[PDB]
Paper text:
BG24, a VRC01-class broadly neutralizing antibody (bNAb) against HIV-1 Env with relatively few somatic hypermutations (SHMs), represents a promising target for vaccine strategies to elicit CD4-binding site (CD4bs) bNAbs. The VRC01-class of bNAbs targets a particularly challenging epitope to elicit bNAbs against due to the presence of the CD4bs N-glycans that sterically obstruct interactions between Env and Ab CDRs26. The glycan at position N276gp120 is highly conserved and poses the greatest steric barrier to binding VRC01-class bNAb iGLs, as Ab residues in the iGL CDRL1 that interact with this region are typically 11–12 residues and cannot accommodate the N276gp120 glycan. Mature CD4bs Abs develop shortened or flexible CDRL1s to accommodate this glycan.
Two iGL versions of BG24 Fab constructs were made starting with the VH1-2*02 and VL2-11*01 heavy and light chain germline gene segment sequences: one containing the CDR3s from mature BG24 (BG24iGL-CDR3mat) and the other containing the iGL CDR3s (BG24iGL-CDR3iGL). We also solved a 1.4 Å crystal structure of unbound BG24iGL-CDR3mat Fab, which exhibited six disordered residues within CDRL1, but otherwise superimposed with a 1.3 Å root mean square deviation (rmsd; calculated for 225 VH-VL Cα atoms) with the Env-bound BG24iGL-CDR3mat Fab structure, suggesting no major structural differences upon Env binding.
Residue numbers in the entry:
A (entry chain H): 1 to 52, 52A, 53 to 82, 82A, 82B, 82C, 83 to 100, 100A, ...
B (entry chain L): 2 to 9, 11 to 26, 31 to 91, 96 to 211
Write the structure that this text describes.
């Protein structure tokens, strides 16, 4: 089986370096180039460069020049990709890949891929959320129904969970996956759709749980004035 | 060098779908399933690596290469990337339709009084119940586009197998109060739903 096996996932701080390995088996490692390709979460593929395992020669994409070093150890059929001066936006899956079995002269595309190595780069430290009410109004109303919610801002790390009315309110609840901000902190929102006639009669409380900071917040959400 | 492909293509089981890739003879196509490396499906326009189903084929017009999948199967739902030498297209999500298409429900919340009193302002655009799971989000201040301060999530699946996403616009209280309105515009399958909010003392 022609295959590439990569090292496991890594967590790093900005400014540090990461070194990912890629071990070839089932084919002659030194007969073929080795490339690296990365993919940021939710984003597309981007080629980083190649190494020739026989000569040790390399060629890198302009984006990674000065920061990426590709090497190999032919005695153990292993290629390495070291990325230095890490940025939070280097958070990505890093793949090794190459072309072994194809009928082509170009060396692209790649039929053999490693499984990928997730590298997370973050400067954030544990922080509990700030919870703000998302008040209902005639704008957030439609079928006699009003939307109200809670914004759970600026926490780290994941996860946060939200219930409504200590779990008594489940119908019409939608808690959204978090966004990761450029600060390195997460925010999410939870919204519930309720009868607009029930506003003022029924109390709505969102129950936010951030176990990583041992924090719970119960935020009352009432209509505007 | 700058390969362009559609963000979203879809078809029903048994149908044929085509994904285009436009550039400036070596175009190749990868399929990528969640949590897995890309898998090469077609290379050098039309060649199939061993073991790739005959339902996958490639062709090239002038400067547009095309991947065609005949007899769509559920397992074909995946992201597809075209490539040429070291360059990649931006990817196409292929959905094998298992329920009717559905436009997003969009709710936009203005900054809360509490957040404004804390000297911050966040607009919250919540997008739910859409299928296929591909949207783009744009924001406007009054009528002009706003890109600074925007963060948008990737779509995620809800219990009913439709998708949800959210987008957040960060502003200073002064910016929020200095415009007549702000708008979150969600594009899904070529049509747009836009919600607007305005400062209200």
């Amino acid at each position: 089986q022609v295959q590439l096996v990569q090292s496991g996932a890594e967590v790093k701080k900005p400014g540090a370096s990461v070194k990912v390995s890629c071990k070839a088996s089932g084919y002659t490692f030194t007969g073929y180039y080795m490339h690296w390709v990365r993919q940021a979460p939710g984003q597309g593929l981007e080629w980083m460069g190649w190494i020739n395992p026989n000569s040790g020669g390399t060629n890198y994409a302009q984006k990674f020049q000065g920061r990426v070093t590709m090497t190999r150890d032919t005695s153990i059929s292993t290629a390495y990709m070291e990325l230095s001066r890490l940025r939070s936006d280097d958070t990505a899956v890093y793949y090794c890949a190459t072309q072994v079995k194809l009928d082509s002269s170009a060396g692209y595309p790649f039929d053999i891929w490693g499984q990928g190595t997730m590298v997370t780069v973050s400067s954030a430290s544990t922080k509990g959320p700030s919870v703000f009410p998302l008040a209902p109004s005639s704008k957030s109303t439609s079928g006699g129904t009003a939307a109200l919610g809670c914004l759970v801002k600026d926490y780290f790390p994941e996860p946060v969970t939200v219930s409504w009315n200590s779990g008594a309110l489940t119908s019409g609840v939608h808690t959204f996956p978090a966004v990761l901000q450029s600060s390195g902190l997460y925010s999410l929102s939870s919204v519930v759709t309720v009868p607009s006639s029930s506003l003022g009669t029924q109390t709505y409380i969102c129950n936010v749980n951030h176990k990583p900071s041992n924090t719970k917040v119960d935020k009352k959400v009432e209509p505007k004035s | 060098s700058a390969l362009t492909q559609p963000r979203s293509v879809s078809g029903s089981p048994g149908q044929s779908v085509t994904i285009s890739c436009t550039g400036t003879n070596y175009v190749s196509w990868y399929q990528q399933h969640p949590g897995k490396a890309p898998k090469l499906m077609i290379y050098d326009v039309s060649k199939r690596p061993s073991g790739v189903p005959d339902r996958f084929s490639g062709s090239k017009s002038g400067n547009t290469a095309s991947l065609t999948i005949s007899g769509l199967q559920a397992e074909d739902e995946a992201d597809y990337y075209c490539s040429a030498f070291e360059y990649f297209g931006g990817g196409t999500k292929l959905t094998v339709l298992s329920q009717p298409k559905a436009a997003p429900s969009v709710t936009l919340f203005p900054p809360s009084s509490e957040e404004l009193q804390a000297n911050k302002a966040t607009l919250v655009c919540l997008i739910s119940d859409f299928y296929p799971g591909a949207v783009t989000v744009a924001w406007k201040a009054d009528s002009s586009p706003v890109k600074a301060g925007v963060e948008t999530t990737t779509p995620s699946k809800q219990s009913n197998n439709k998708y949800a996403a959210s987008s957040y616009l960060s502003l200073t209280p002064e910016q929020w109060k200095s415009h007549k309105s702000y708008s979150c515009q969600v594009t899904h399958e070529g049509s747009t739903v836009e919600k607007t909010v305005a400062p209200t003392e």
